[PDB]
Structures are given as C-alpha cells and as structure tokens.
Amino acid sequence: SGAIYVGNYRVVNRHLATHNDWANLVWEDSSRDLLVSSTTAQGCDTIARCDCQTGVYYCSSRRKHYPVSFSKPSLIFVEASEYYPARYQSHLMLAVGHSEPGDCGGILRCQHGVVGIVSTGGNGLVGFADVRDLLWLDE
Ligand SMILES: COC[C@]12C[C@](C(N)=O)(CN1C(=O)Cc1ccccc1OC)C2
Ligand SMILES: [Zn+2]
Numbered sequence: 001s002g003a004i005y006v007g008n009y010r011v012v013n014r015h016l017a018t019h020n021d022w023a024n025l026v027w028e029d030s031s032r033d034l035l036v037s038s039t040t041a042q043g044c045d046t047i048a049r050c051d052c053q054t055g056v057y058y059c060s061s062r063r064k065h066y067p068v069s070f071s072k073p074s075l076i077f078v079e080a081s082e083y084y085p086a087r088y089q090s091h092l093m094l095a096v097g098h099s100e101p102g103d104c105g106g107i108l109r110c111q112h113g114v115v116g117i118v119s120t121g122g123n124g125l126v127g128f129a130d131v132r133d134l135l136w137l138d139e
Pocket of ligand 1: 082119122
C-alpha cells in the first residue's frame with residue numbers, strides 16, 4: 001500500500017484504488033497501473049522533474065529504505081495476475097532490490113522529489129511506475 005499526495009491529487013496503484021478513489025477519479029491508465037483521484041486537503045509531496053536513474057525506495061516488507069539504480073521508463077512485459085491479463089506495462093523502471101506484492105505503493109525518491117511508486121517485482125527485482133512525465137500534477 002501507499003500513495004503520493006501532491007496539491008489536490010492522490011496518486012495510487014490502479015489495482016489498489018478504493019471505492020472513494022474511483023468516485024473522485026481524475027485520470028487512470030491500466031497500461032501504467034496508475035490512478036489519480038482528487039482530494040480536499042493539500043498534499044505533502046513534491047514531484048521530481050529530472051532524468052535521475054538512482055534513488056531510494058521504501059520497502060514495507062522489510063520496514064526499510066534501500067538505494068537503487070533503475071532503468072529509464074519503458075514498455076516491459078508483465079505476467080498475468082488476479083488484477084490484470086498478461087500485457088506490456090508502460091512507463092515502468094526496473095531495478096535490483098527486494099519486493100513482495102504488498103510493497104506496491106512504496107515511494108521511490110531522488111534528490112529532486114518523488115519519482116514513482118512500486119508497481120511490479122519478483123526474484124530480487126523491483127519495478128516502479130514513473131510519475132515524472134505527469135506535468136499536470138503540479139498545477
Ligand atoms: C498480486 O499481483 C499484484 C501485481 C500485478 C502487478 C502489475 N503492475 O501488473 C504486478 N504484481 C505483482 O505482484 C508483481 C510482484 C510479484 C512478486 C514480488 C513483488 C511484486 O510486486 C511488487 C501488481
Ligand atoms: Zn532527480
């Protein structure tokens with residue numbers, strides 16, 4: 001679990017969005033595993049606008065933060081799950097690091113701010129859904 005709170009928006013993994021997120025929907029993209037909903041309270045986070053390929057992410061299954069080197073956002077095949085059919089997930093960045101399914105939502109940050117959230121993993125890999133291209137989050 002986890003969310004980014006920026007301005008009057010809440011960013012979550014689309015597969016973990018609540019009934020309230022869908023009732024206050026702003027934008028969603030099944031191919032990116034992202035959903036953004038509107039909020040009444042002003043957010044606590046700032047979004048990075050950069051090309052960093054290193055950062056630190058929060059891993060809830062270890063209660064710890066880990067440093068990572070990750071690939072640029074790209075189209076990567078993701079096996080079928082209870083949430084999605086077998087498909088290519090876009091704007092995904094992979095790195096070597098621990099992750100379990102419940103780690104989705106953990107924030108990845110660089111020195112400039114929030115980069116993305118955990119969305120995939122397995123076998124010593126962790127995948128993050130990028131949010132740096134969503135310029136409208138800032139206004
Ligand atoms: C239970 O499946 C949830 C989803 C489907 C997902 C999607 N983006 O399509 C991928 N999932 C995974 O669970 C992948 C996974 C497997 C092993 C370890 C960690 C890990 O994710 C953090 C999110
Ligand atoms: Zn950066």
